Design an enzyme around this catalytic site. Structure first.
Site, PDB file in Angstrom:
ATOM      1  CG  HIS A   1      -1.872   1.081   1.220  1.00  0.00           C
ATOM      2  ND1 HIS A   1      -2.874   1.242   0.425  1.00  0.00           N
ATOM      3  CD2 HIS A   1      -2.169   2.096   2.179  1.00  0.00           C
ATOM      4  CE1 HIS A   1      -3.622   2.260   0.742  1.00  0.00           C
ATOM      5  NE2 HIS A   1      -3.017   2.871   1.695  1.00  0.00           N
TER       6      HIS A   1
ATOM      7  CG  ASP B   1       0.502   1.171   5.167  1.00  0.00           C
ATOM      8  OD1 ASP B   1      -0.288   0.417   4.614  1.00  0.00           O
ATOM      9  OD2 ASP B   1      -0.103   2.103   6.132  1.00  0.00           O
TER      10      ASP B   1
ATOM     11  CG  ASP C   1      -6.032   2.698   3.965  1.00  0.00           C
ATOM     12  OD1 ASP C   1      -5.135   3.771   4.147  1.00  0.00           O
ATOM     13  OD2 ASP C   1      -6.433   2.010   5.046  1.00  0.00           O
TER      14      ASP C   1
ATOM     15  CG  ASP D   1      -1.189   5.827   2.179  1.00  0.00           C
ATOM     16  OD1 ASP D   1      -2.096   5.484   1.796  1.00  0.00           O
ATOM     17  OD2 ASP D   1      -0.440   5.364   3.128  1.00  0.00           O
TER      18      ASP D   1
ATOM     19  CG  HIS E   1      -6.908   6.585   0.953  1.00  0.00           C
ATOM     20  ND1 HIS E   1      -6.534   6.029  -0.242  1.00  0.00           N
ATOM     21  CD2 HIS E   1      -6.214   6.238   2.004  1.00  0.00           C
ATOM     22  CE1 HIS E   1      -5.443   5.340   0.119  1.00  0.00           C
ATOM     23  NE2 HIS E   1      -5.380   5.429   1.482  1.00  0.00           N
TER      24      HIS E   1
END
Ligand SMILES: *[C@@H]1O[C@H](CO)[C@@H](O)[C@H](O)[C@H]1NC(C)=O
Ligand SMILES: N[C@H]1S[C@H](CO)[C@@H](O)[C@H](O)[C@@H]1O
Ligand SMILES: [Zn+2]
Length: 1014
Positions: free
Chosen positions: A60, A311, A174, A62, A441
């Site tokens: 993941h 993550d 997420d 971000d 997000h």
């Protein structure tokens, strides 16, 4: 066309009905804390029926959160992708899925050609698989559907061009709660499957018990089911490894091989992973297979999905090795031990879904149907994630402004083909990408660290400047005689004038049109209307003299009103908030009438005295202890008085009454009707002194809100023929009610200043008998019925208000439309409330590591529509949707897609023309051209232009509403040679259209068309 009002869909799971029935008890379920001790029959699987297990490696990433996009890219993501390329290239059986295209594109363009070819090869061969393929994994609460589509299209267009692949499976592990707007857009974009994870722990338990975690998710109004998209909801608390191998995290953590020590990670459950060897592989497999079989009990087929990631995982080569080697030892043992009756292997997301559907087709399982949404999410106890529906509201409002500027810039420039030197494609690509990045997000949600929020803001600021450049170059080209048109592509022919962003009191950014006998007698201005129907709207400009009159380009006079320029000041000496008027700048206001998707030119001219067609507003300042307020040449002296109730009426519109504190108290629709009680009130929520604290994500109030102590506020009343308003300086908010003849516009300049641990809410109190029902929208696409549940805490009854909310009874409805997403609810019959801003000193234990103390002034805008609905054909009591009236829908459009205003920069515009688009079809009011985008550069022999058409559904309330023309987007540009219906991303042709005519779409449907021109 399906009827979206009168036929209640029959589905197996309807989320509002489920919510009404569930008790939401939070009991300790054992090792699966929010579930129960899963049991299975070991004899379920055997030689003829094995459990197929797909372990899917993932990471993941971000695009900004606690580091900026670029910081993460440099520190982590480029290493993850570089090592994924090496490791997959060298281990043919290893697999990996990738979601965030913003990072992948950044990486790929920096690769040398040899590595670009190796990367294309591991994608072509199925080892590296893209899931969803959007620029980001967007927030699903605050995001507008138009921007969800924009970012999906940005990432997928890049993937088709460079990787030659278009994902048909979506991965959303997420976002904080999930919206049916996603399957809606995905199913119309070629998708066949989707996966979600963050849903209320009580919902996971309930659906797991009924094996309803995999369902065909259709829209709430869809009777037939054509919008259905197969969805897989993960069952547990997290997508991390401890919560993805099965129900017991103490056991699953032992299978995250990055947690043995050297990587600085460990298992909270105090049992570490151990390297797999020939001596422990049977016991280790015993444990793992038992977790897998327990997880498998929650689903219907013999195909099991086991995500393996967390993550920013798979960064170091050593990590790739420790996970792969240990898992390969486990697979070799397990798959050779018949007694387990399991075949396990690394796989991709698409592989999992293909096998699930193969089982389904073999008659092994039938899946339930479901409609509804998954808000508001709670990951544990009473920790509901409704705070992020409001966090960092300045950027939430900025999102809507940029949403509109991108649409306008792409539409205005689509009419022509541009030389590469104009840098039109370049500027538009930057604008789409920065807005797309913010859909992340941790972007629009307001959940990033302060310096990351600053990065998103700067990116968006550059995107707005890019949009302005493209828009003004387009206007100059569209309205200048062709043989005179002589562009300098770096020059600014027009300056955009936006009266609501950043907004009066937020930034003095608007330019004043400076006129004078000794400098310039007149100025041309141009309005653009991005909506596909003729539209009138009042527009205002600042001018250097009150003696200005307006004409259209045929020199016909246009009625205008001049008002002063009022700015509010928190006077640190007198300790009062009061307005000051300018003695050198004034506001001129007039009605502009603009063609569908067109432009209209006007001229402002100065005169030495009051013009015949310009009137002047009166101004009344109510407060005790007043002081003079001179206004330069403004022709009407300001009047003063002690605070008192006020009533106003503009045109033939409603009559509004206000309290002596300047707040609305009633609305009278017509001259004879009752003064319906509608009261605005500002209140404040606090934070708990013991227990969990509210933060960027969580809303944990210390009880119901308390009224803000108003004192004796200063109220300013401006009364004009075209526009009147009442403005009041309240603590933390300059609240303004503006009237132009229809539903009022409300503007709040919110500056929470240093009020720590405070959330400011704006509430409407009415006597409408709504009971426990209210409606809020999902991504500006549809309105969903909500039911207040007293069995849940206050914060659980807060829902996203991305663009509107309403309450109604048999006869009356009150709708509040918004120009920015914020959180809100109806906590008691007859009420509506929406949070304005929140300033929180504490971190809420979700990883952000800071509170929210970076508030800045924001101008929130709204339209307030009170209407009688007794004659309206509404859905039955059991229908889960609600629909707007024509007035409420147009009010929403006035906030999200207003006319754009351009001021000619130079002294004289040679070759200027008065209008563009007068021959464009004025489509029915419920139809919108959401997107108009030229898809080809000028060197393409065959030009292509794409259109996204959306038809909403408006209530039939007895208004004949007639005369409109059919809109065929394929004939908007000349020389059409082909017309095709495509997926919404324009990437796949679905239908070759007869006569090159694009049929309009059905209510609540969205279609895309591409026209080709020779
Ligand atoms: C691209 O799309 C498919 C991949 O299966 C194939 O038919 C085509 O040859 C591929 N090659 C290209 C266009 O790079
Ligand atoms: N894993 C999550 S944790 C945090 C939530 O607690 C989220 O906001 C970030 O986007 C991460 O990626
Ligand atoms: Zn995340």
């Amino acid at each position: 066309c399906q009827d979206v009002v009168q036929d209640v869909p029959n589905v197996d799971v309807q989320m509002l009905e489920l919510y009404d029935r569930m008790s939401f008890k939070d009991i300790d379920g054992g090792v699966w804390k929010q579930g129960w001790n899963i049991k299975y029959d070991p004899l379920k699987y055997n030689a003829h029926h094995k459990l197929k297990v797909f372990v899917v490696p993932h990471s993941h990433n971000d695009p900004g959160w606690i580091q900026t996009f670029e910081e993460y890219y440099q520190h982590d993501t480029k290493h993850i992708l570089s090592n994924a390329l090496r490791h997959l290239h060298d281990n043919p059986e290893m697999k990996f899925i990738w979601a965030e295209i913003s990072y992948f594109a950044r990486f790929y363009h920096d690769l040398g050609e040899n590595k670009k070819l190796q990367m294309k090869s591991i994608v072509k061969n199925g080892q590296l698989e893209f899931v969803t393929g959007g620029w980001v994994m967007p927030d699903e609460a605050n995001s507008h559907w138009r921007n969800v589509l924009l970012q999906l299209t940005e990432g997928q267009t890049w993937l088709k061009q460079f990787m030659n692949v278009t994902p048909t499976a979506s991965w959303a592990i997420d976002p904080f709660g999930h919206s049916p707007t996603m399957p809606y857009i995905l199913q119309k974009s070629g998708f066949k499957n989707m996966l979600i994870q963050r849903t209320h722990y009580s919902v996971k338990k309930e659906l797991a018990q009924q094996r309803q975690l995999e369902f065909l998710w259709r829209q709430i109004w869809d009777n037939k089911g054509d919008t259905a998209l197969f969805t897989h909801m993960m069952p547990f608390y997290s997508y991390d490894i401890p919560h993805t191998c099965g129900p017991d995290p103490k056991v699953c953590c032992q299978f995250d091989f990055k947690r043995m020590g050297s990587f600085g990670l460990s298992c909270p459950w105090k049992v570490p992973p151990r390297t797999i060897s020939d001596q422990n592989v049977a016991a280790r497999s015993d444990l793992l297979v038992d977790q897998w079989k327990k997880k498998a009990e929650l689903y219907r087929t013999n195909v099991l999905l086991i995500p393996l990631g967390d993550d920013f995982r798979f960064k170091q080569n050593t990590e790739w090795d420790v996970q792969r080697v240990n898992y390969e030892r486990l697979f070799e043992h397990i798959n050779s031990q018949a007694h387990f009756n399991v075949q396990a292997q690394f796989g991709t997301l698409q592989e999992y879904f293909d096998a699930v559907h193969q089982a389904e087709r073999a008659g092994q399982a039938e899946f339930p149907t479901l409609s509804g949404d998954f808000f508001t999410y709670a990951d544990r106890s009473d920790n509901y994630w409704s705070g992020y529906y409001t966090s960092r509201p300045y950027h939430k409002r900025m999102d809507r402004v940029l949403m509109h500027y991108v649409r306008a810039a792409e539409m205005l420039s689509a009419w022509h083909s541009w030389d590469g030197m104009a840098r039109i494609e370049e500027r538009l690509e930057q604008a789409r990408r920065e807005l797309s990045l913010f859909q992340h997000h941790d972007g629009i949600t307001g959940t990033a660290k302060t310096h990351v929020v600053v990065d998103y803001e700067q990116r968006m600021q550059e995107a707005l400047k890019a949009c302005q450049m493209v828009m003004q170059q387009s206007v100059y080209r569209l309205l200048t005689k062709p043989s005179i048109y002589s562009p300098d592509f770096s020059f600014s022919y027009f300056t955009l004038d936006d009266s609501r962003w950043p907004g009066s009191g937020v930034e003095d950014s608007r330019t004043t049109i400076i006129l004078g006998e000794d400098i310039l007698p007149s100025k041309h201005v141009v309005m653009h209307n991005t909506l596909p129907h003729w539209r009138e709207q009042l527009v205002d400009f600042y001018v250097s003299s009150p003696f200005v009159s307006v004409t259209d380009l045929a020199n016909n006079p246009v009625e205008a009103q001049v008002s002063p320029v009022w700015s509010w000041h928190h006077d640190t000496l007198t300790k009062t908030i009061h307005p000051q008027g300018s003695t050198t700048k004034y506001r001129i206001i007039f009605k502009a009438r603009v063609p569908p998707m067109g432009l209209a030119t006007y001229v402002l001219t100065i005169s030495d005295s009051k013009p015949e067609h310009t009137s002047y507003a009166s101004n009344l300042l109510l407060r005790k202890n007043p002081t003079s307020l001179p206004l330069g040449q403004y022709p009407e002296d300001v009047k003063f008085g002690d605070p008192r109730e006020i009533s106003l009426r503009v045109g033939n519109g409603p009559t509004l009454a206000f309290s002596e504190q300047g707040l609305l108290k009633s609305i009278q629709l017509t001259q004879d009707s009752p003064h319906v009680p509608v009261h605005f009130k500002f209140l404040k929520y606090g934070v708990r002194s013991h227990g969990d604290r509210s933060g960027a994500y969580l809303f944990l109030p210390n009880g119901p809100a308390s009224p803000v102590e108003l004192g004796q506020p200063v109220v300013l009343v401006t009364k004009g023929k075209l526009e009147s308003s009442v403005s009041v300086g309240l603590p933390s908010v300059v609240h303004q009610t503006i009237m132009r003849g229809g539903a009022p516009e409300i503007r709040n300049l919110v500056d929470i200043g240093s009020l720590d641990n405070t959330e400011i809410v704006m509430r409407l109190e009415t006597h409408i008998d709504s009971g426990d029902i209210f409606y809020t929208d999902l991504n500006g696409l549809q309105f969903i019925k909500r039911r207040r549940l007293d069995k849940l805490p206050l914060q659980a009854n807060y829902y996203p208000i991305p663009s509107g909310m309403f309450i109604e009874d048999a006869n009356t409805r009150l709708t509040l439309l918004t120009g920015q997403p914020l959180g809100g609810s109806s906590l008691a019959s007859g009420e509506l409330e929406i949070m304005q801003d929140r300033r929180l000193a504490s971190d809420d234990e979700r990883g952000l590591g800071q509170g929210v103390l970076d508030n800045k002034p924001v101008l929130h805008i709204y339209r307030l529509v009170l209407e009688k609905v007794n004659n309206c054909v509404r859905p039955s009591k059991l229908h889960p949707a609600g629909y707007l009236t024509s007035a409420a829908h147009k009010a929403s459009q006035s906030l999200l897609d207003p006319l754009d205003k351009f001021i000619f920069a130079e002294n004289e515009w040679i070759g200027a023309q008065g209008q563009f688009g007068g021959d464009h079809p004025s489509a029915r009011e419920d139809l919108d051209v959401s997107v108009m985008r030229r898809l080809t550069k000028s060197s393409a022999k065959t030009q292509r232009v794409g259109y996204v058409l959306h038809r909403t559904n408006l209530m039939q309330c007895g208004t004949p509403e007639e005369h409109t023309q059919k809109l065929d987007v394929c004939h908007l540009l000349p020389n059409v040679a082909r017309c095709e219906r495509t997926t919404l991303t324009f990437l796949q042709n679905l239908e070759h259209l007869d006569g090159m005519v694009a049929p309009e779409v059905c209510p609540m449907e969205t279609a895309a068309y591409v026209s080709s021109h020779s």
